Structures are given as C-alpha cells and as structure tokens.
Homo-oligomer: A and B are copies of this chain.
Amino acid sequence: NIRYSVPEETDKGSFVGSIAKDLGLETRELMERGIRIVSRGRSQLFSLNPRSGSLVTAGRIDREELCAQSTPCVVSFNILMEDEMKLLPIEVEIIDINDNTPQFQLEELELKMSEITTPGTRIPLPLGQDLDVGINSLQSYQLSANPHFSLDVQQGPEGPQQPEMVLQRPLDREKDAVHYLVLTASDGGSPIHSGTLQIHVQVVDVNDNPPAFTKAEYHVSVPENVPLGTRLLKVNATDPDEGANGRVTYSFHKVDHSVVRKFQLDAYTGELSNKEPLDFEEYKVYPMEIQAQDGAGLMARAKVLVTVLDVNDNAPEVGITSVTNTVPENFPPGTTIALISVHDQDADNNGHITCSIPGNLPFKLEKLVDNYYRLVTERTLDREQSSRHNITITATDQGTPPLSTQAHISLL
C-alpha cells in the first residue's frame, strides 16, 4: 500500500510521487517489470511514466468534483506490473485548496418587520455555501454595522451553523423606514473569499403618534358686531404617521353646545369662523375645546378663547314701569306722576343712560338710584289751559355713536 499526498487543482504533469524510489527500483527494473496504471474512471487524473518511475498528474484534480465534502479524499488505483502480473495499490490523498467563493442562494433578502416588533426577535438567515472544505470552507458570518440588529452565529463542530439576525434597538418607522444591511459570509483561506447577501429590512407603520397643535391655547379678540362667517382663526396639527394614520380632521369637543353652536370649525382646514351673532352681554368670552382626530383613534386637544370686544350697538330700553294716569288738579310741587325703568345692555361709556324731557312743561326729572327716574313736577298747571298731554321722554346713552330709546306717555 503506497500513499501519496498531492493538492487539488494541480497543473497538468505535476509530480505526485516516484514509485521507483519507494519500491527500490531503478529505471531499468521499472522497464523490465513493465509497470503501467490499471484504468478505471478515477485513475484518468493520474499518469504513470514507466521510465522515470514518477507517477504525476494527468489532468485537473478537482477534489470538490471527486469527494465533494468528505475528508480525507484519497484516490485508490492499481498499478499492473506485467512481469510478475502483480497489482500494487496506490492511494493518493487530495489536499484541498481555495478556488471558490461562498454562494448565497439569492442576492437580496427582503423582510417586513413592524416598528412594534419586540426587541430580541430572531430571524434565521440564508445559508451561504463554500464549495471548498477544511479551512477554505465557510468559517464566519458578519452582519453589516447597524444599531438595530446584531449577528448571532452558532458554533458548530464542522463550522458556523444557523446564522441569526437579532433585533437590538427597537425600530422606529418615523425615523428610519428602510434599513439596508449586508450579510457577508467569509471562508478562511488566504486571501479570503466573501459572498455578499444584501438585506432589505422594511419597517411597517403602526399608529403610535397623535396630532400635535402649534399652540396649546388659541386666543382671539373679536368685535361684537362682527359679520356672520368672519374667519376667526386657523389651527395647525401635524401627524408623522403614514397614510390613514396621518390624516387629521378637526371637530368640536362636546363641551357646552350653547357655546359651540355659535361657532363653526371646518373639519379639514381647521378654520374657525362665527356662525351666530356674538353678543357681549351674554358672553364676554367664548371658551371652547377643540379636537384633532387622525384615522386610527388617536386625538389631540387645544383650547380656543374668543374674547368679545364692546362697541355701542345696544340702545337703552325704557320700560313704562309706573304710571299714575290720574293726576290731581291741585297737586303740590314735588309729586311723582310717573316712574320709569331704564336699562342699557352695554358697558363702559357705551352703557350710561341719560333722561330727557321737554323743558317747557313744569314737571322735571331728577336723579334717582339704579337708572330709575322719578318724574316730579316743579310748578302748577291750569285746568283750562291744558286738558290732554302726549309727552315724549328721550333716553340716550353717552357712548358715540349714541343710541336712544323714546317712550310716549298720554296723561290727563
């Protein structure tokens, strides 16, 4: 049993072993025995020269073609010596070399992972196969640098097995929606042959962000006589989510509908304008809470305060709250014939009321408490001179433009 060692992929005619030296044969003795190689499929790679006694290579010795993945790879063929008709077992071990690159069964691996994927989730990676064996076979995986993922390689007896990609830092689609990684598989030769696997990690969206107003409280000041449908304000709300999770619509929070009903907020543009007249008397200010809803149950809040300014638009009102229609012929000076109830719905200088009566007639109005005015007479009237009187009392407020209300009293 003769055993040699030759690397694989040798050049044609490369020396393997000299049979002459190990059998003790010269050139002549080899010629006399008539040594020649016994053929079978595999011995076609080996060539025996009967004069030099040197078994050399006859062709390409691709050990991956011969033994695939086994070790060691030894080719056994018989040498026929015609003299004694003697067979001689020659076994030649094929040492492995590195001439192949690890091949992934694809070029781009595309995966879908939600942004709420719990960190630590594992993804088995495609296996890369190095055609060589031994030290020139698959030796290591390397995941391209990225904060969100890490590489986990199980140490196996034959080599690295079952590569896995682990989620480290939690995903955020609003920051990075697509992560490109590169899984490089490398053997252990010199130089090292690396096969690359492109990884396309796509992040799926989840409604995790409610709208956000530009201001927490929206203030505005408006005249009371402001016409209907005047644009009071425009709010602004943003949503960073994708698609239906990021389309906002505004609406009124059901607070006090007696206040909300006096206003109008466009659901799409968010422009608040007035729908009903604005009266300073009932409401000086208008507090309202507004709401912005996206498409998936999230919402945001904001406050809107509509302060009403005052301008003279309400005239005082005079109520004929007292009338003594029958007034004596001999009444003394200082007797009240009528008491009136005066009231202006406005404030400041626009809300004070003065009383006016024609000054020729004897009776006059004096100052009394709380816009009440007492009509007391200052002289005597003749029974013959005046039988019937149709008097016109004038109540004017003092804020320009002044507003006035008249009351007419008939007396006898």
Contact = CB atoms under 8 A, between A and B. Distances in A.
Contact of A127 (B106, B256, B299, B326): B256
Contacts of A118: 210
Nearest to A203: B297
Nearest to A334: B85
Interface stretch (A34-42, A50-58, A217-225, A263-271): A34-42
A374 interface: yes
Contacts of A322: 38-40, 78, 87
Contacts of A116: 206-208, 298
A296 B206 contact: yes
Interface residues of A, number: 60
A119 to B, nearest CB: 13
A149 to B, nearest CB: 15
A121 B297 CA distance: 12
Count this chain's copies in the assembly: 2
A412 to B, nearest CB: 16
A253 interface: yes
A150 B121 CA distance: 36
Nearest to A261: B105
A234 interface: no
Interface string A308-345: 00000000000101111010000110111001010000
Contacts of A85: 324, 326, 331-332, 334-336
A301 interface: yes
A319 B116 CA distance: 62
Given A208-B116, A334-B85, A105 B39 contact: no
A136 interface: no
Contacts of A299: 112-113, 121
Interface string A15-56: 000000000000000000000001111000000000000000
Nearest to A324: B85
Given A38-B339, A78-B339, A336-B87, A105 B258 contact: yes
Contacts of A131: none
A124 B125 CA distance: 51
Contact of A41 (B124, B321, B336): B321
Given A105-B257, A208-B116, A322-B87, A124 B289 contact: yes
A296 B114 contact: yes
Nearest to A113: B297
Chain A, interface SS category: loop
A40 B341 contact: yes
Nearest to A259: B127
Interface string A174-209: 000000000000000000000000000011101110
Contacts of A123: 253
A113 B41 CA distance: 77
A122 interface: yes
A151 interface: no
A80 to B, nearest CB: 8
A244 to B, nearest CB: 11
B254 A112 contact: no
A255 interface: yes
A7 interface: no
Contacts of A121: 299
A160 interface: no
Given A38-B339, A80-B324, A117-B298, 17 more contacts: A39-B321, A40-B321, A41-B321, A41-B341, A78-B321, A87-B322, A87-B339, A112-B297, A114-B207, A116-B207, A116-B208, A116-B298, A117-B210, A124-B301, A126-B255, A127-B256, A203-B297
Q: Top 3 nearest A-B pairs by Cβ distance?
A: A204-B297, A114-B297, A85-B335
13 contacts: A39-B321, A40-B319, A78-B339, A105-B254, A105-B258, A109-B254, A114-B296, A116-B206, A117-B210, A117-B298, A124-B254, A126-B254, A202-B297
